[PDB]
Structure formats: structure tokens, C-alpha cells
Design brief:
The complex is a heterotrimer.
Chain A: no helix or strand
Chain B: E1 3-12, E2 21-28, E3 31-37, E4 46-47, H1 57-84, E5 94-103, E6 109-118, E7 121-126, E8 133-135, H2 138-149, H3 152-161, H4 163-174, H5 176-179, E9 186-193, E10 198-208, E11 214-219, E12 222-223, E13 229-230, E14 234-235, E15 241-250, E16 257-262, E17 270-272
Helix pairs in contact in B: 3-4
Chain C: E1 6-11, E2 21-30, E3 36-41, E4 44-45, E5 50-51, E6 55-56, E7 62-70, E8 78-83, E9 91-94
Antiparallel strand pairs in C: 1-2, 2-7, 3-4, 3-8, 5-7, 6-7, 8-9
The chains are: A little secondary structure, B alpha+beta, C mainly beta.
Bound molecules: sodium ion (3 copies).
């Protein structure tokens, strides 16, 4: 399952 | 044996040809099991291994929500990085990210990983402690400060030590017949004259899984590292891999050479010679 | 900043004249990701060709497998034609049953 937290560079 | 899970993301800008493409693929060891492509007619997470097909609609919806949101996040990130390096809006650039977990033979977590690259150059990586970052340059320091402010490392550590390991173990059980089955190489030695006084001895390994293998040539029991031509391991397309190693030998001296094969599927390592 | 593709052309199964098999063209070690790969039968582009999903190695270089079903014969010559930003002209690699 992928990592769910979104964080732009 | 030892096993890992990895997700690989590639985001590529293409000025003048629409918005950046975002593609994600997921692997357990050398087996791909999922894909998401923002360029697909109807972008959705799709199965790529038979053992993942049993997952429920909630799993597919959860994956798709994450990957659809990442398509947007990565398009913003490509705009941000272009600004950090004072680049023009004219060129195409790529962000790659790879993350996941490694388990040892007992199924326990060995280590977690998270690494990103910009235009094929290391950009930022989570340290082995899963608590701190290594930024390659002053542009990556901006990303490092944002990720510290959102407490990214803390969330990533909890995922790597938790969900990542738990889902990997589930996949290894569901896919045990293939993921936990090591297929040994089928091996043989060929001989090809190069001239009247030299010939090529080629040692073949076919049909093996996983990709990890050791193929070497020895002359009188000593490794021939500098004189061995060793092709990259290549996929056959049926899950298995192929590889060969070759040495150019003086005619009449062929029996002084041995090919040594090490692979997980073999009951014992092999010692092969040319058999005329 | 740019890396040229490595190219290997080979069959899935040991080649047997008159026996259906799969012709593979493996491109790897390249950067950036855009690449054009065609499988040829006697210099002509085979139109039914499948390929793997874009992924990359630990060194960030990309790889792809292009494949099609084929029946090798004594006469028919197979090859892989590759174009990439690092190449001035498309690189053609001939299928050799011993490689
Ligand atoms: Na992030
Ligand atoms: Na693209
Ligand atoms: Na900060």
C-alpha cells in the first residue's frame, strides 16, 4: 500500500 | 528469505505538450504488482500481479485517491524545483522518488528507505534513522525545511515501520507460491572459436527468479574479474531472468576454466566446464 | 546529466526454428525517460509490440522491456531499433541467437 501523506517539494 | 517492497514514482514535465505525467509502480522484490499512470484514458490504480487482484474495492479507491492527489502534488513540485534552480519554463525536467521497506528472513524490519532525485541527480533522502534528512544542495534545503514543518519524517517513519511492513507481509502470504519460490537457473557452457588460437567460453543462466545471481569464471581456481565480459541481468518476460558471462581462452586450455553459479533456487552452487 | 541506453535483443526461450517464442528488446541505464523502441522483422516495424511500465534502477536510470510473439526461422532477421536524446541517429541492434 502507498504512503498517504501529501507533501510538495 | 529476505524481501522488500518499493514504490517508484516518476514525474516528468513536457512544456508545450500538456501537464506533467505522473507514473507510479509498486514492487515486491522483482515482481511488479500495481501501476498508476496520469496519462491513461481513465487514470486508476491497476493490478499487475495475479495475487493483488483479490484486494477489495476500498483498497483500489484508497490507492487511486493517493495517486491522483500525488499527480497534483508532483506537478506543483516540478514548478517549485524549476524555481529553486532558476531554470527556464522551456525545458523538460524529472522528479523520481523511491521508498519502501526491507525485511530479513524472519520477516522483521531491517531498514526503511525514502530517496528522491531531480534530473537523475540525488536531491533529498531520509536518513537510515528515519528521523532526519540529507539534502544534496541549497535547493534541496528548501524542501528539507518544508518537510520538517509538516513533520513528514515522523509520518514516514510510522508508515515504514507499520503499514509498509504489514502490507508487505500480507502480499508475501497471498503471493507465496511465486514471491516465496526461488526458481534456479538452467545452465550451460557454449564454445565459439574467435581465431585459430583463441575461443570464447560463455556461461549461461536462464529461467531464474529472483534476479540476484553470481556468475563468474575461474582459471586454475582464480577469479577472472578483469577478463570476464558480464552482460546485465535481463528479464525474459515470464517473471524469470537471464544472464551470461564470457571469457576468451587460448585454444587447448579450456579445461583450466570453470564457471561458478550461485543462486537461491539451487540445491547446491554449480561448477560448470565446457563439455565437448 | 544524460545517459545513453544499453540495449539487449534476445528470445524468452532458447531459439528453435519453426517454434513460436517471444522476441525481447531490453533497454536500460538511460536518462531521461523518453525513448522510442521498435522490433523489426527483415527491416520492417512489427506493429503488435507490448512494453513494460516505466521503472528505474537504484542509480535512477530507466529501463523498459519491449516484446512480441515471433517464430524464428533460418532466413528471417530480427532486430531492435532505438532512438533516444543521446543518439544522433537510431541505433539498430541485431538479434543473435548466441547472445
Ligand atoms: Na512528501
Ligand atoms: Na511522458
Ligand atoms: Na522548517
Amino acid at each position: 500500500i502507498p504512503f498517504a501523506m501529501q507533501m510538495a517539494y | 528469505g529476505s524481501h522488500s517492497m518499493r514504490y517508484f514514482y516518476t514525474a516528468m514535465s513536457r512544456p508545450g505538450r500538456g501537464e506533467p505525467r505522473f507514473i507510479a509502480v509498486g514492487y515486491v522484490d522483482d515482481t511488479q504488482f500495481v501501476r498508476f499512470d496520469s496519462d491513461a484514458a481513465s487514470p486508476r490504480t491497476e493490478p499487475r500481479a495475479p495475487w493483488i487482484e483479490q484486494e477489495g474495492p476500498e483498497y483500489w479507491d484508497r490507492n487511486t485517491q493517493i495517486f491522483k492527489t500525488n499527480t497534483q502534488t508532483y506537478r506543483e513540485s516540478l514548478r517549485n524545483l524549476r524555481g529553486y534552480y532558476n531554470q527556464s519554463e522551456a525545458g523538460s525536467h524529472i522528479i523520481q522518488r523511491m521508498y519502501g521497506c526491507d525485511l530479513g528472513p524472519d520477516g522483521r524490519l531491517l531498514r526503511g528507505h525514502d530517496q528522491s532525485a531531480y534530473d537523475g541527480k540525488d536531491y533529498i533522502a531520509l536518513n537510515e534513522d528515519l528521523s532526519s534528512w540529507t539534502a544534496a544542495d541549497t535547493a534541496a534545503q528548501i524542501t528539507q525545511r518544508k518537510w520538517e514543518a509538516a513533520r513528514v519524517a515522523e509520518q514516514l517513519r510510522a508508515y515504514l515501520e507499520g503499514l509498509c511492513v504489514e502490507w508487505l507481509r500480507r502480499y508475501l502470504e497471498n503471493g507465496k507460491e511465486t514471491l516465496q519460490r526461488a526458481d534456479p537457473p538452467k545452465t550451460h557452457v557454449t564454445h565459439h572459436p574467435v581465431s585459430d588460437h583463441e575461443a570464447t567460453l560463455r556461461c549461461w543462466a536462464l529461467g531464474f527468479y529472483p534476479a540476484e545471481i553470481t556468475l563468474t569464471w575461474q582459471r586454475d581456481g582464480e577469479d577472472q574479474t578483469q577478463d570476464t565480459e558480464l552482460v546485465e541481468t535481463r528479464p525474459a518476460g515470464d517473471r524469470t531472468f537471464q544472464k551470461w558471462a564470457a571469457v576468451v581462452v587460448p585454444s587447448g586450455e579450456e579445461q583450466r576454466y570453470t564457471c561458478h553459479v550461485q543462486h537461491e533456487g539451487l540445491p547446491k552452487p554449480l561448477t560448470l566446464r565446457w563439455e565437448p | 546529466i544524460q545517459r545513453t541506453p544499453k540495449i539487449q535483443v534476445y528470445s524468452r526461450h532458447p531459439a528453435e526454428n519453426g517454434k513460436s517464442n517471444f522476441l525481447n528488446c531490453y533497454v536500460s541505464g538511460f536518462h531521461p525517460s523518453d525513448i522510442e523502441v521498435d522490433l523489426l522483422k527483415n527491416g520492417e516495424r512489427i506493429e503488435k509490440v507490448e512494453h513494460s511500465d516505466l521503472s528505474f534502477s537504484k542509480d535512477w536510470s530507466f529501463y523498459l522491456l519491449y516484446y512480441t510473439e515471433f517464430t524464428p526461422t533460418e532466413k528471417d532477421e530480427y532486430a531492435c531499433r532505438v532512438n533516444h536524446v543521446t543518439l544522433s541517429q537510431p541505433k539498430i541492434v541485431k538479434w543473435d541467437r548466441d547472445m
